[PDB]
Amino acid sequence: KRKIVLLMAYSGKGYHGMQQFKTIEDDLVSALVRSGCIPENHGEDMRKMSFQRCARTAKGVSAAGQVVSLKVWLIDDILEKINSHLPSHIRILGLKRVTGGFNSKNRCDARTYCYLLPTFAFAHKDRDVQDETYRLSAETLQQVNRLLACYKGTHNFHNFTSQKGPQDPSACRYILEMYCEEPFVREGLEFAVIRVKGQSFMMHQIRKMVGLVVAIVKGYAPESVLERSWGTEKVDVPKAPGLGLVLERVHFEKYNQRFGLHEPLDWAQEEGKVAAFKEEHIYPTIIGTERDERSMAQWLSTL
Structure with missing residues (x-):
């Protein structure tokens, strides 16, 4: 319903990359589902919300400024919501409303x-x-x-x-x-x-x-x-x-x-x-x- 770009950060330890353990995106998708931003089927197949990341950070690698892009239901106080379903060591720091045709991976x-x-x-x-x-x-x-x-x-x-x-x-x-x-x-x-x-x-x-x-x-x-x-x-x-x-x-x-x-x-x-x-x-x-x-x-x- 509204294509956005998120600025996010995370500690790499305990994860298996951005995309044997869980990944960074597993926590985010879980948070996106729980907040009500996205429907369950969109979490099962991220293509359906047109998910893109800029950097496929490897195992254990951290990020202070990862950028992703996706379509969501643009709910009230969305940042607080997503963050409330996340651990300490993962944060969504910023949101920018963007055109539908946008793709963060290719245009960076x-x-x-x-x-x-x-x-x-x-x-x-x-x-x-x-x-x-x-x-x-x-x-x-x-x-x-x-x-x-x-x-x-x-x-x-x-x-x-x-x-x-x-x-x-x-x-x-x-x-x-x-x-x-x-x-x-x-x-x-x-x-x-x-x-x-x-x-x-x-x-x-x-x-x-x-x-x-x-x-x-x-x-x-x-x-x-x-x-x-x-x-x-x-x-x-x-x-x-x-x-x-x-x-x-x-x-x-x-x-x-x-x-x-x-x-x-x-x-x-x-x-x-x-x-x-x-x-x-x-x-x-x-x-x-x-x-x-x-x-x-x-x-x-x-x-």
Whole structure:
């Protein structure tokens, strides 16, 4: 009855992707059914409400700004309703009324991800402290950033995914920005955040991009391998865990220079919520997982 676009956020842990455990969409559909937004048959076959997501986030991957689009009964106080049938770690942050022909998946352009990791993924395997007390130096952070900056621009990223040959056009991808933020300490443990904006991403690309920069900084490999990895010959690139991977923003920067959308598509009023959900549900869960289960310490021992 009224096609809409939802801005939503979630903690990835305990789910099996967006689309053996339940998925993010299972919780949402359940909430959509219970709120009265959609009929049961529409939940059984999501095509009937024309459901679309922008990012098929993988197992364990979180999101601060996932975007979906669908037809619903536009009930009173719809946001509160849907949210009242959802857990804490899943939130519908915003609603925008949109034209019926709209498809969020196809009409979006760039993507921004985040990677939250303990800082000992950057400790040199010989000259740095080898326990939890390690603290990222300004020199090393600088190395990390210069390395991440080498990714900027266009490249043949075939070595950062799989099942794609070097001559394959779809293997080429475009990175807009990539860097690491200044570290912070939560209860004796230090972490840091990596941000990456790309026009589009392939399977494991970000995880492999981060895995390689980790392998270099730690000193398991020389800087040379970064430029080598773009050559046609195959190079086994280390794939970092997906635990700290966070979909941050789905962009529509090129939407108007291509279309002209019953109301504009920016989430400016929801920004305080966006940050809040990140600080309350996304970040502490990742931190809690590294503290108790040691995802990163385990993956590091495999290099």
